[PDB]
Design an enzyme around this catalytic site. Sequence first.
Site, PDB file in Angstrom:
ATOM      1  N   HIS A  64      -0.098 -13.102   8.408  1.00 54.99           N
ATOM      2  CA  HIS A  64      -1.476 -12.759   8.253  1.00 54.99           C
ATOM      3  C   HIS A  64      -2.078 -13.429   7.016  1.00 54.99           C
ATOM      4  CE1 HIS A  64      -5.183 -10.543   7.924  1.00 54.99           C
ATOM      5  NE2 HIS A  64      -4.769  -9.905   6.841  1.00 54.99           N
ATOM      6  N   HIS A  66      -4.745 -12.935   4.511  1.00 59.85           N
ATOM      7  CA  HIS A  66      -5.418 -11.736   4.083  1.00 59.85           C
ATOM      8  C   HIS A  66      -6.781 -12.028   3.536  1.00 59.85           C
ATOM      9  CE1 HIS A  66      -5.387  -7.480   2.438  1.00 59.85           C
ATOM     10  NE2 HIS A  66      -6.460  -8.027   1.898  1.00 59.85           N
ATOM     11  N   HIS A 109       0.892 -13.085   3.986  1.00 64.38           N
ATOM     12  CA  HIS A 109       2.112 -12.290   4.052  1.00 64.38           C
ATOM     13  C   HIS A 109       2.571 -12.019   5.467  1.00 64.38           C
ATOM     14  CE1 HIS A 109      -0.216  -8.560   4.993  1.00 64.38           C
ATOM     15  NE2 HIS A 109      -1.075  -8.998   4.094  1.00 64.38           N
ATOM     16  N   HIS A 111       3.222  -9.967   8.609  1.00 64.70           N
ATOM     17  CA  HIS A 111       2.576  -8.766   9.182  1.00 64.70           C
ATOM     18  C   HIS A 111       3.433  -8.246  10.362  1.00 64.70           C
ATOM     19  CE1 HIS A 111      -0.431  -5.760   9.484  1.00 64.70           C
ATOM     20  NE2 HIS A 111      -1.287  -6.380   8.689  1.00 64.70           N
ATOM     21  N   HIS A 395      -3.838   5.885  -1.347  1.00 65.12           N
ATOM     22  CA  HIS A 395      -3.576   4.956  -0.251  1.00 65.12           C
ATOM     23  C   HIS A 395      -4.656   3.866  -0.249  1.00 65.12           C
ATOM     24  CE1 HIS A 395      -0.586   7.595   1.460  1.00 65.12           C
ATOM     25  NE2 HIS A 395      -1.408   8.619   1.277  1.00 65.12           N
ATOM     26  N   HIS A 398      -7.204  -1.115   4.134  1.00 65.19           N
ATOM     27  CA  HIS A 398      -7.618  -2.469   4.393  1.00 65.19           C
ATOM     28  C   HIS A 398      -8.079  -2.596   5.827  1.00 65.19           C
ATOM     29  CE1 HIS A 398      -7.746  -6.714   4.494  1.00 65.19           C
ATOM     30  NE2 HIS A 398      -6.685  -6.831   5.268  1.00 65.19           N
ATOM     31  N   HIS A 400      -9.137  -5.505   8.553  1.00 72.46           N
ATOM     32  CA  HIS A 400      -9.097  -6.908   8.917  1.00 72.46           C
ATOM     33  C   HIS A 400     -10.455  -7.351   9.450  1.00 72.46           C
ATOM     34  CE1 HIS A 400      -4.591  -7.732   9.241  1.00 72.46           C
ATOM     35  NE2 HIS A 400      -4.707  -6.557   8.669  1.00 72.46           N
ATOM     36  N   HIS A 450      -5.650  -0.136   8.136  1.00 71.84           N
ATOM     37  CA  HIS A 450      -4.444   0.566   7.775  1.00 71.84           C
ATOM     38  C   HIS A 450      -4.271   0.676   6.284  1.00 71.84           C
ATOM     39  CE1 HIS A 450      -2.286  -3.080   6.461  1.00 71.84           C
ATOM     40  NE2 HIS A 450      -2.989  -3.676   7.412  1.00 71.84           N
ATOM     41  N   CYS A 451      -3.392   1.592   5.903  1.00 68.56           N
ATOM     42  CA  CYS A 451      -2.938   1.639   4.532  1.00 68.56           C
ATOM     43  C   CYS A 451      -2.064   0.407   4.264  1.00 68.56           C
ATOM     44  CB  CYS A 451      -2.122   2.903   4.274  1.00 68.56           C
ATOM     45  SG  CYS A 451      -1.569   2.895   2.560  1.00 68.56           S
ATOM     46  N   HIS A 452      -2.324  -0.278   3.146  1.00 65.45           N
ATOM     47  CA  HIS A 452      -1.596  -1.525   2.812  1.00 65.45           C
ATOM     48  C   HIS A 452      -0.327  -1.278   2.007  1.00 65.45           C
ATOM     49  CE1 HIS A 452      -0.994  -5.841   2.556  1.00 65.45           C
ATOM     50  NE2 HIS A 452      -2.194  -6.111   3.055  1.00 65.45           N
ATOM     51  N   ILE A 453       0.072  -0.023   1.835  1.00 62.54           N
ATOM     52  CA  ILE A 453       1.410   0.296   1.386  1.00 62.54           C
ATOM     53  C   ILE A 453       2.295   0.064   2.617  1.00 62.54           C
ATOM     54  CG2 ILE A 453       3.017   2.092   0.653  1.00 62.54           C
ATOM     55  CD1 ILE A 453       0.538   3.293  -0.940  1.00 62.54           C
ATOM     56  N   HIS A 456       4.153   2.712   4.542  1.00 63.50           N
ATOM     57  CA  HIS A 456       3.289   3.665   5.256  1.00 63.50           C
ATOM     58  C   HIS A 456       2.729   3.056   6.551  1.00 63.50           C
ATOM     59  CE1 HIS A 456       2.175   5.679   1.131  1.00 63.50           C
ATOM     60  NE2 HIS A 456       3.476   5.708   1.365  1.00 63.50           N
ATOM     61  N   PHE A 461       0.726   4.457   9.705  1.00 62.60           N
ATOM     62  CA  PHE A 461      -0.566   4.805   9.066  1.00 62.60           C
ATOM     63  C   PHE A 461      -1.608   3.716   9.330  1.00 62.60           C
ATOM     64  CE2 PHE A 461      -2.132   6.939   4.817  1.00 62.60           C
ATOM     65  CZ  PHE A 461      -2.863   7.873   5.519  1.00 62.60           C
TER      66      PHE A 461
HETATM   67  O1  PER Z   1      -2.995  -7.096   5.169  1.00 58.40           O
HETATM   68  O2  PER Z   1      -2.401  -6.335   6.268  1.00 58.40           O
HETATM   69 CU    CU Z   2      -0.403   4.782   2.142  1.00 64.50          CU
HETATM   70 CU    CU Z   3      -2.760  -8.056   3.516  1.00 66.12          CU
HETATM   71 CU    CU Z   4      -5.861  -8.418   6.106  1.00 64.40          CU
HETATM   72 CU    CU Z   5      -3.043  -5.656   7.940  1.00 70.10          CU
END
Ligand code: PER
Ligand code: CU
Ligand code: CU
Ligand code: CU
Ligand code: CU
Length: 497
Positions: A64, A66, A109, A111, A395, A398, A400, A450-453, A456, A461
């Site tokens: 992905h 980002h 990164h 995905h 949290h 993010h 997209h 989604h949460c980017h942790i 999670h 998540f």
């Molecule tokens: O950035 O998923």
């Molecule tokens: Cu989270």
């Molecule tokens: Cu990302």
């Molecule tokens: Cu992204």
């Molecule tokens: Cu993502």
Amino acid sequence: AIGPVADLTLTNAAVSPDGFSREAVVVNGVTPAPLISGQKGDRFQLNVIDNLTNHTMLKTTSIHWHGFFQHGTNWADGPAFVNQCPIASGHSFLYDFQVPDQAGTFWYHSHLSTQYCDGLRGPFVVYDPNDPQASLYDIDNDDTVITLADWYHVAAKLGPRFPPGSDATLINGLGRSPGTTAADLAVIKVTQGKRYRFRLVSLSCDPNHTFSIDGHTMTIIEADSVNTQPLEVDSIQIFAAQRYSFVLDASQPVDNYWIRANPSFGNTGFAGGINSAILRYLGAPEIEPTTTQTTPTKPLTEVDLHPLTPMAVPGRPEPGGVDKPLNMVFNFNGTNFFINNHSFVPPSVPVLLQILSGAQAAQDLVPEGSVYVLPSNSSIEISFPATVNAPGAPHPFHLHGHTFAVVRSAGSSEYNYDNPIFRDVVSTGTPGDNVTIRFQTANPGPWFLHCHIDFHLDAGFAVVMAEDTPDTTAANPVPQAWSDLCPIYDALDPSDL
Ligand SMILES: [O-][O-]
Ligand SMILES: [Cu+2]
Ligand SMILES: [Cu+2]
Ligand SMILES: [Cu+2]
Ligand SMILES: [Cu+2]
Ligand SMILES: *[C@@H]1O[C@H](CO)[C@@H](O[C@@H]2O[C@H](CO)[C@@H](O[C@@H]3O[C@H](CO)[C@@H](O)[C@H](O)[C@@H]3O)[C@H](O)[C@H]2NC(C)=O)[C@H](O)[C@H]1NC(C)=O
Ligand SMILES: *[C@@H]1O[C@H](CO)[C@@H](O[C@@H]2O[C@H](CO)[C@@H](O[C@H]3O[C@H](CO)[C@@H](O)[C@H](O)[C@@H]3O)[C@H](O)[C@H]2NC(C)=O)[C@H](O)[C@H]1NC(C)=O
Ligand code: NA
Ligand code: NA
């Protein structure tokens, strides 16, 4: 740096960014993955060559990019089982997209699952040759990108499902752990009298970091990919996947100064020079700093960020003042995260392919209850009220395909419908907060939210915002190479994932 046209070859190799050797996922031989760059208007052709051999860190992959809108190239966005099937080892896939209308600081990164934690993560900068901030600095180049990464001694699929922070923080790929306090530190070189645009990129899988530089202030000029009115600060809390550009005026005495990136949890503080790097003025001895921390008197607050160029907030200036308001109710059962009573489970048929095959209504898209269909050309408001039911806060969520207005930030009760910051990753804060965003659906396709942790996300998540399903197939013609991914992936033995 490499790009805009480049091969990114993925292999497994032993690395010791903090003096401890472990096997990792590397890109062109290194982790963090190398800086990719180009400039506004470029066509990026990034050929991902998957030569991964290690099943524990996944031999399959997806990348992905980002922060990019990917308008008409939803198929290249990267999320596994949303926008594509994963690429298989022994195969290649070409991501080919344009960036006609964006510039700034981005990153890239894996995905797929928690693979980015194992090393597949790096910075990506699109320069603006007419950057409106350019008179504020003298130097903006490959050596002014500063990456932050949480680094783990045990691999993502071998350690805890929810790790209690990392062993080390890496700054430009180097750092110390409590057991490796003589490991080499990263050095960022400056020349006295010059002004630097540093591009701070959080590659974190989980913890946020509080970033500062002894003896220096920082002028923020960009937040994620959005130019800001210049804002002077002396400390920045940066959440996973966020970026900031700041100007540093190297006007202090010629010396070594500690750069600090204190994680919100894990191995905290600075004993033995953990969570640290070195700002070295040219001519100073090549030794560790002995500067001391000072209390921030001007910490970054998100509400103090405003766009450099006026950016109108979608809708009308009151709660629910949009075509489509949505409230995301978080939960957790000890194993899985939930949004509105649904924990995301990646489907066999990618969401984009389901839509191309004719599934246009939310009730016909799988997984059901995690896919929201949004009307085209409409204003959207999404609230993410923090709750004790979703532990691991704050949290950082993010979206997209979009930058969004942050009408209400964490730790603020105000709603700003006039000049709030726009960005792409936002902290949802802690119980009491009700972080709220707006955006407009001008970008047909399914977009992950989604949460980017990453731990999670992998525990579910996430939801998918399926925007303009009726024009999705026409707007995003796919290459044959993309059509070919699913049959390749679906043929693999479980042991070759
Ligand atoms: O950035 O998923
Ligand atoms: Cu989270
Ligand atoms: Cu990302
Ligand atoms: Cu992204
Ligand atoms: Cu993502
Ligand atoms: C976080 O913010 C969101 C968005 O403002 C809150 O959701 C909204 O909550 C209000 C209730 O205070 C809902 O308004 C109600 O609508 C019904 C008719 O549908 C009406 O009878 C009531 O008089 C009231 O106006 C609103 O629908 C709802 N918005 C959405 C999209 O669900 C949310 O409650 C906040 N959460 C926390 C914990 O503060
Ligand atoms: C494929 O990638 C794997 C994940 O990085 C990697 O896992 C490594 O596996 C070994 C066990 O085989 C672990 O080492 C352990 O053994 C030492 C004693 O030598 C003890 O300290 C502990 O019992 C420890 O568990 C590594 O910790 C583990 N690495 C990571 C980063 O978790 C495999 O080795 C890789 N496969 C190949 C062929 O390279
Ligand atoms: Na380049
Ligand atoms: Na920008």
